[PDB]
Amino acid sequence: EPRAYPFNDVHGLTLAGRYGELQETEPVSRVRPPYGEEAWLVTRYEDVRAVLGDGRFVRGPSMTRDEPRTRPEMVKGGLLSMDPPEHSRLRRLVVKAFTARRAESLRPRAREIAHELVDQMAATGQPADLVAMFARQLPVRVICELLGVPSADHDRFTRWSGAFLSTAEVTAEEMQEAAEQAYAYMGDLIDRRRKEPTDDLVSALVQARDQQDSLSEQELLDLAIGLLVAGYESTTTQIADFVYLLMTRPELRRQLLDRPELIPSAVEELTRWVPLGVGTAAPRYAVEDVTLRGVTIRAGEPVLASTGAANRDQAQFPDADRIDVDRTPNQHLGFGHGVHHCLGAPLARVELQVALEVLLQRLPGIRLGIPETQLRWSEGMLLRGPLELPVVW
Ligand SMILES: CC[C@H]1OC(=O)/C=C/[C@H](C)[C@@H](O[C@@H]2O[C@H](C)C[C@H](N(C)C)[C@H]2O)[C@@H](C)C[C@@H](C)C(=O)/C=C/C=C/[C@@H]1CO[C@@H]1O[C@H](C)[C@@H](O)[C@@H](OC)[C@H]1OC
Ligand code: HEM
């Protein structure tokens, strides 16, 4: 009676047909995930937005509940596990430091890094793996620039970070050692910056004040590592998926080569269209009974709000399955909605823009150097994207 979930096949970016059916016949329905409790699934744009934006739907129970999910282990904590007012306080301090202006200031360093990565690929000759050499490299290096990790330390910081990716095949202790190295280093960097501040985010986070409040020592550290993990795999996977789409849809590539000024709009349309998640936004828990589409979600029940399906809802987006780089309006939920809206979105936007700009300017003939049907797709079961993208140019 509840349907087995996820519906998405991980071996591709296709939106499961089941979503559209439910948007039409059963917009609030029951699902059984591979791990964790049965939950409600909400699929219409208006309802998904309503859930992520409604005060009666909270994240705190995540910490004491068996969350609907695709993997046996549970990754808990961070800002996304918090509710106002505690969430509000931490978020006000972070954004006071992590401004859209800071994000934009990073575009020139993001481009320089992107050029380096493309040099390194040209150096080893076609076919190069776009995933290993570029997509897994650009976002963690940009996070290094953002935080203020000295250039000398970018390689070891990148090495430790790759062990946090859901696609890493390392043992538990290997991952554990990489995490303790990342924590110790970050705590030390924070301590330097406190007693000798520079222009980087760690310095600004240390000095951030809000009506006499400040971030504690532990807060600073947990927030810095939280930015890394929230900002690495997401961006890496979306770069891979966007270039995969550029390489397999000639009209998309051609539109952006003829008119690179369309890249920012194409980044929005692709963020809308790509159902990047295997499943949904982090479960929200009802704090009281809430009636939605005339179904009563009872207090305490978990609710999985699919931004993947919402972004492809025909009721909100004309001809929703079409990728249209000029689409307007495009009020997609690809960076979420409500108090947990992606804190890093201006910088993600910068990176994704830069990735496409540099790749298209350096390698305008970039294309797959194996057939599409032979691509290997990640089975990490959190996000969808290719494990390797061998490319020729
Ligand atoms: C795909 C996106 C997420 O990836 C993840 O959720 C990463 C999960 C990986 C797969 C985990 O590693 C696995 O642990 C198992 C116990 C063993 C397994 N192997 C060895 C067989 C191993 O692969 C976790 C436990 C790895 C550790 C280092 C970790 O805590 C990772 C955190 C990364 C979270 C990533 C980012 O999501 C962010 O999660 C936070 C909990 C939220 O607060 C928020 O960030 C502030 C969120 O992004 C919106
Ligand atoms: C293309 C890349 C990215 C995508 C598609 C993405 C998407 C998201 C989405 C959908 C959420 C809301 C999740 C939910 O409500 O369950 C979120 C939250 C968050 N993101 Fe991102 N994100 C990206 C990149 C980044 C970057 C680069 C950073 C930081 C540098 C970042 C930091 C965060 C943090 C800290 C949160 C939790 C915010 C909160 O709970 O208050 N993200 N992101």
Please provide the DSSP assignment of 126-138 as one string.
SSEEHIIIIITTH
Instruction: Please name the residues in contact with 43: beta carbons below 8 A apart, sequence gap of 6 or more.
Output: 19, 22, 23, 27, 29, 306, 309, 310, 313
Nearest in space to 312 (alpha carbons), one of 302, 301, 323: 323
For residue 234, the CA-to-ligand 2 centroid distance in Å is 8
Ligand 1 closest atom vs CA 171: 20
Q: Whose CA is nearest to atom 6 of ligand 1?
A: 75
Question: Was 125 annotated as part of a binding site?
Answer: no
Ligand with minimal distance to 335 CA: 2
Reported in sequence order, the residue ranges of the chain that DSSP labels E, i.e. its strands, are: 3-4, 28-32, 39-42, 57-58, 128-129, 284-286, 290-292, 295-297, 302-305, 367-368, 390-392
Ligand with minimal distance to 59 CA: 2
Phi (first) and psi of residue 368, to 5 degrees? -70, 140
Whether the upstream peptide bond of residue 260 has omega within 30° of 0, thus cis, is no
In testing the pocket of ligand 2, which one of 102, 234, 273 has its CB within 8 Å of the most ligand atoms? 234
Q: What is the resolution of this structure in A?
A: 1.9
Q: Which amino acid is at 71?
A: R
**Measured CA angle at 269 (ends 361, 145), to 5 deg:** 55
DSSP assignments along 34-66, one per residue:
SBS--EEEE-SHHHHHHHHH-TTEESGGGGGS-
Query: Distance of alpha carbon 103 from its chain centroid, rounded?
Result: 16
Beta-carbon neighbour count of residue 334 at 10 Å? 24
DSSP assignments along 260-313, one per residue:
GGGHHHHHHHHHHH---BSS-SS-EEESS-EEETTEEEPTT-EEEE-HHHHTT-
Method: X-ray
Q: Whose CA is nearest to atom 22 of ligand 2?
A: 342
Ligand 2 closest atom vs CA 98: 30
- Contact 34/70 with Cβ under 8 angstroms? yes
Ligand with minimal distance to 84 CA: 2
Q: Whose CA is nearest to atom 25 of ligand 2?
A: 231
Partners of 28 in beta bridges: 42
Nearest in space to 366 (alpha carbons), one of 152, 127, 90, 150: 127
CATH class of the domain whose range is 1-393: mainly alpha
